[PDB]
RNA sequence: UUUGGAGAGUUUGAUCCUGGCUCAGGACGAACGCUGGCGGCGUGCUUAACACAUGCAAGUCGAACGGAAAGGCCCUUUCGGGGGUACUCGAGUGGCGAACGGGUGAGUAACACGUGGGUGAUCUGCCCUGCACUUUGGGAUAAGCCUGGGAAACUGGGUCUAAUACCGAAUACACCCUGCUGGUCGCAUGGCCUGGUAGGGGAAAGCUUUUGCGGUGUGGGAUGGGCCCGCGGCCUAUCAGCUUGUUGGUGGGGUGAUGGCCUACCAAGGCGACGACGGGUAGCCGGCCUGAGAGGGUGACCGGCCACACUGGGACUGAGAUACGGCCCAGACUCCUACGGGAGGCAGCAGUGGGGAAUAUUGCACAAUGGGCGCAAGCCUGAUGCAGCGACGCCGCGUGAGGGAUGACGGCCUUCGGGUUGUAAACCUCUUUCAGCACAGACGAAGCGCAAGUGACGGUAUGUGCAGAAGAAGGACCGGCCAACUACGUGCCAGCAGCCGCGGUAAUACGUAGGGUCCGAGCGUUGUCCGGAAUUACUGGGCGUAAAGAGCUCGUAGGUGGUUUGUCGCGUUGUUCGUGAAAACUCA
């Protein structure tokens, strides 16, 4: 499933503001609840859990799936952390977000799931679609004239684009050079504490 | 039984049983006659019964009542008994 | 009786067969003496990969094929290579390789103008 | 030349150590509780190898045969029906199949399994390929007709009919047996040269006019097996002696084959502390779960082997039999009986009862794949392919997305200011996945058929459009391990709790509210296994006082072995070949 609840509060519990645009946390700094500003016992488990949840709720991934991503990263070679980030960034909701068509991973998820996209000709209603090297992500014919993509092409200068990605058309076709490296990821997070968590 | 094919195969198998019974019994009778001729000590009678019994053993093996290897072992035993006599 | 057969593999609505040689008294999904081909009839050209030399061995030593695999051998010409009627037909058609994703990538880059 | 181990709490006034207990993780053929939307792919009697109603689960061949009961065709015709053939076919004879497939794991601690070998100790229907033939003659009988007995099951008789049924004979000189004999291999019996030679022997089935089918013997091959052996994999000595066909041999028998397999005789051996014989438990394996690995545990699906088919025993038939849906006997149970006798076997599929914490529909179709029969069409196939049921599991998707404040109300706290719930909500905008409505609509089928069509799944999946957030979120936890905290109520009560332990009016541990947190159509609990546990320590522990040196010696088996030369190449090591099934696991 997915988390359809409030978005700011997760960022508040986890410190890092994933999206932004609130004043409660931004004036008084605290996690949610009446017991904000409380005393904290500074446990490594909380640190690790907080990075894991940072990833989970920055993307739209739940734990039973994030576990699989971690396991894929741990099996496949290289550093488990950057492999995991490569996986989490190499999914459709994230690539269209990073391309700026949605300006929120929630919105990107709704778009892909509603089928306002496709990949190499075939429709895709899967936000968890793991894109690959040399992937053309087209938008369908109704969607290009719909309002959200009008907004995309209008405000496609706000947030930057990764290097491994590039938009190519005014119709907002998207291209994938390769898969991202830890420099290409550009996410407010480490990746070691998560693998430590799942190694516990 | 409760199936047509088995109900028929009962009759067929009884038929084949009676056939093979008659044949094997004739064979054992021939062999006891031969062994009587031998333990008594007759020689030419024993040779004649040996030819007859070997013929019948080959015949039964061809009919399938016995295996050719079985017929071979039986008649070989007969021949060796006659020789050592 | 030794026989060329199709062992079903694959998931429920994806009958990927594997062309084996096995006794008739075996079961479909059972132990195979040798694997000589595969048969995936969900492709439109309905893939017919085979191993001709071993097919010819088993036919020469008297492996009675099933009807489907007989048709497959007729397609690959091994049936005809075995008997000798039109020599060896070679009726097989394969799925044409779709263009490389790299080629599509470069084509769309060129179109990005 | 690559790889992958986390700890915490608890003994004390406190410390260190030892040491156990507990927990955090993962998994399940699961169950239970709360909750519950969708699909996809799987999976589902782990207990009573308990008993089973009912229906299906193995038939086919008229191109083997006599025939003609039902259709068909033609004569006939009182329209009641009667004749013929030969399309077609009930029943019957005959052939082939029925030994496969499917189920269960009761038994089995064993060559049952796995792995590797041996078979000069062996079989092998069907299939393929060579060689030689398919000669000749006869006697019945089922069925049918006429009867008889029996309640029934069933069965006796007479008469009559045919065959690829049955039976004799000829030929076979490849084959079998015996005698003599040569060469060669040898791993000893012995094997090969289809050795040679002499003698005596061994068979057959015909049918049909059509893409034609067959039959016998023999050689070879292939397949499927059988038998034997090495090694390997449970507990138990609070089970130490066991064995008398038991160990061996000879001659016979028997087998497909070797062999006490069996028998007469002979000899008196054989097995045991390296655990015989007993007792208990258990199907074995690939694999699965865990684990850093070693290892531990397990043997569900799936796949292979074995064993079994109400219990026990037995054979027959056949190429082949544990003969599930076969036979005989005995026994238990159930049923019919005219009491004389008879009939049965779900551990096949579905299903019922029962037991249980607990496990599905008395479904569709042979469309596909596999099998059987048939020249073939085709028939059969509860194998199988699909569907159904059940969150049982795994995976995926959704339940909305963007914007939206001094931040509404309400709720809970408040140090009374306010803080939070909470960008949450209301409201603007957008989106329609999924579900719903209409239309189309498959792949699966170079298939089957030489008939004109053929898809159970399925008017399903999936594509198109239609409307609107429109129909879609719970569960556990919040003292520490273990993030996450307050108020109120109860105060050694009610209760909680996995361990430490919390409750003895100011409870962050109980109950409820808020709020937070962990997951999310799941969440928790219980049970089981591994881990953590270096807590049986090979990797990887120890024994002065923590549990642990026998009271001490002698000495058997065993284990171990100073310096050195040579050799063997057993261990060891290198390389290669074969095998290590597929699936699995892993990499792509």
Curated annotation (Swiss-Prot), chain A:
<keyword id="KW-0689">Ribosomal protein</keyword>
<dbReference type="Pfam" id="PF00163">
    <property type="entry name" value="Ribosomal_S4"/>
</dbReference>
<comment type="similarity">
    <text>Belongs to the universal ribosomal protein uS4 family.</text>
</comment>
<protein>
    <recommendedName>
        <fullName>Small ribosomal subunit protein uS4</fullName>
    </recommendedName>
</protein>
<dbReference type="InterPro" id="IPR036986">
    <property type="entry name" value="S4_RNA-bd_sf"/>
</dbReference>
<comment type="function">
    <text>With S5 and S12 plays an important role in translational accuracy.</text>
</comment>
<dbReference type="GO" id="GO:0003735">
    <property type="term" value="F:structural constituent of ribosome"/>
</dbReference>
<dbReference type="GO" id="GO:0019843">
    <property type="term" value="F:rRNA binding"/>
</dbReference>
<feature type="region of interest" description="Disordered">
    <location>
        <begin position="1"/>
        <end position="41"/>
    </location>
</feature>
<keyword id="KW-0699">rRNA-binding</keyword>
<dbReference type="InterPro" id="IPR022801">
    <property type="entry name" value="Ribosomal_uS4"/>
</dbReference>
<dbReference type="GO" id="GO:0006412">
    <property type="term" value="P:translation"/>
</dbReference>
<feature type="domain" description="S4 RNA-binding">
    <location>
        <begin position="90"/>
        <end position="156"/>
    </location>
</feature>
<dbReference type="InterPro" id="IPR018079">
    <property type="entry name" value="Ribosomal_uS4_CS"/>
</dbReference>
<dbReference type="InterPro" id="IPR005709">
    <property type="entry name" value="Ribosomal_uS4_bac-type"/>
</dbReference>
UniProtKB/Swiss-Prot annotation, chain B:
<dbReference type="InterPro" id="IPR036510">
    <property type="entry name" value="Ribosomal_bS20_sf"/>
</dbReference>
<comment type="function">
    <text>Binds directly to 16S ribosomal RNA.</text>
</comment>
<dbReference type="GO" id="GO:0003735">
    <property type="term" value="F:structural constituent of ribosome"/>
</dbReference>
<feature type="compositionally biased region" description="Basic residues">
    <location>
        <begin position="6"/>
        <end position="19"/>
    </location>
</feature>
<dbReference type="InterPro" id="IPR002583">
    <property type="entry name" value="Ribosomal_bS20"/>
</dbReference>
<comment type="similarity">
    <text>Belongs to the bacterial ribosomal protein bS20 family.</text>
</comment>
<feature type="region of interest" description="Disordered">
    <location>
        <begin position="1"/>
        <end position="21"/>
    </location>
</feature>
<dbReference type="GO" id="GO:0070181">
    <property type="term" value="F:small ribosomal subunit rRNA binding"/>
</dbReference>
<keyword id="KW-0689">Ribosomal protein</keyword>
<keyword id="KW-0699">rRNA-binding</keyword>
<protein>
    <recommendedName>
        <fullName>Small ribosomal subunit protein bS20</fullName>
    </recommendedName>
</protein>
<dbReference type="Pfam" id="PF01649">
    <property type="entry name" value="Ribosomal_S20p"/>
</dbReference>
<keyword id="KW-0687">Ribonucleoprotein</keyword>
<keyword id="KW-0694">RNA-binding</keyword>
<dbReference type="GO" id="GO:0006412">
    <property type="term" value="P:translation"/>
</dbReference>
Curated annotation (Swiss-Prot), chain C:
<dbReference type="GO" id="GO:0006412">
    <property type="term" value="P:translation"/>
</dbReference>
<keyword id="KW-0689">Ribosomal protein</keyword>
<comment type="similarity">
    <text>Belongs to the bacterial ribosomal protein bS16 family.</text>
</comment>
<dbReference type="GO" id="GO:0015935">
    <property type="term" value="C:small ribosomal subunit"/>
</dbReference>
<protein>
    <recommendedName>
        <fullName>Small ribosomal subunit protein bS16</fullName>
    </recommendedName>
</protein>
<dbReference type="GO" id="GO:0003735">
    <property type="term" value="F:structural constituent of ribosome"/>
</dbReference>
<dbReference type="GO" id="GO:0005737">
    <property type="term" value="C:cytoplasm"/>
</dbReference>
<keyword id="KW-0687">Ribonucleoprotein</keyword>
């Amino acid at each position: 499933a997915r988390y359809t609840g409030p978005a700011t509060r997760k960022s508040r519990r986890l410190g890092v503001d994933l999206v932004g645009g609130d004043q409660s946390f931004e004036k008084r700094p605290y996690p949610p609840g009446q017991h904000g500003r409380a005393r904290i016992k500074e446990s490594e488990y909380r640190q690790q859990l907080q990075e894991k949840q940072k990833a989970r709720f920055s993307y739209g991934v739940m734990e039973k799936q994030f576990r699989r991503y971690y396991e894929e990263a741990n099996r496949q070679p290289g550093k488990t952390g950057d492999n995991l980030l490569r996986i989490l960034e190499s999914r459709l909701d994230n690539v269209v977000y990073r391309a700026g068509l949605a300006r929120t991973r929630r919105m990107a998820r709704q778009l892909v799931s509603h089928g306002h996209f496709l990949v190499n000709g075939v429709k895709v209603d899967i936000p968890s679609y793991r894109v690959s090297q040399y992937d053309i992500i087209d938008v369908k014919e109704k969607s290009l004239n719909t309002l959200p993509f009008q907004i995309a092409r209008e405000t496609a200068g706000e947030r930057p684009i990764p290097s491994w990605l590039q938009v190519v058309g005014e119709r907002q076709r998207i291209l994938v050079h390769q898969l991202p490296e830890r420099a290409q990821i550009d996410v407010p997070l480490t990746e070691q504490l998560i693998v430590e968590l799942y190694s516990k | 039984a409760n199936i047509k094919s088995q109900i028929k195969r009962i009759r067929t198998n009884e038929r084949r049983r009676l056939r093979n019974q008659s044949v094997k019994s004739s064979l054992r009778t021939a062999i006891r006659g031969f062994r009587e001729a031998v333990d008594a000590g007759d020689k030419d009678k024993a040779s004649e019964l040996l030819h007859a019994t070997s013929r019948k053993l080959d015949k039964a093996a061809s009919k399938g009542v016995i295996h050719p290897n079985q017929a071979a072992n039986k008649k070989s035993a007969l021949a060796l008994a006659l020789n050592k006599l | 009786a030794v026989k060329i057969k199709l062992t079903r593999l694959g998931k429920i609505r994806n009958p990927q067969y594997r062309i084996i040689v096995a006794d008739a008294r075996t079961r479909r999904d059972g132990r195979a003496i040798e694997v000589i081909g595969r048969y995936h009839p969900k492709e439109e050209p309905s893939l017919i990969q085979i191993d001709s030399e071993r097919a010819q061995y088993w036919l020469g030593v008297g492996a009675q094929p099933t009807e489907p695999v007989l048709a497959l051998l007729k397609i690959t010409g091994d049936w005809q290579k075995f008997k000798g009627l039109p020599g060896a037909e070679g009726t097989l058609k394969v799925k044409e390789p779709k263009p490389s994703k790299l080629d599509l990538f470069n084509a769309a880059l060129a179109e990005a103008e």
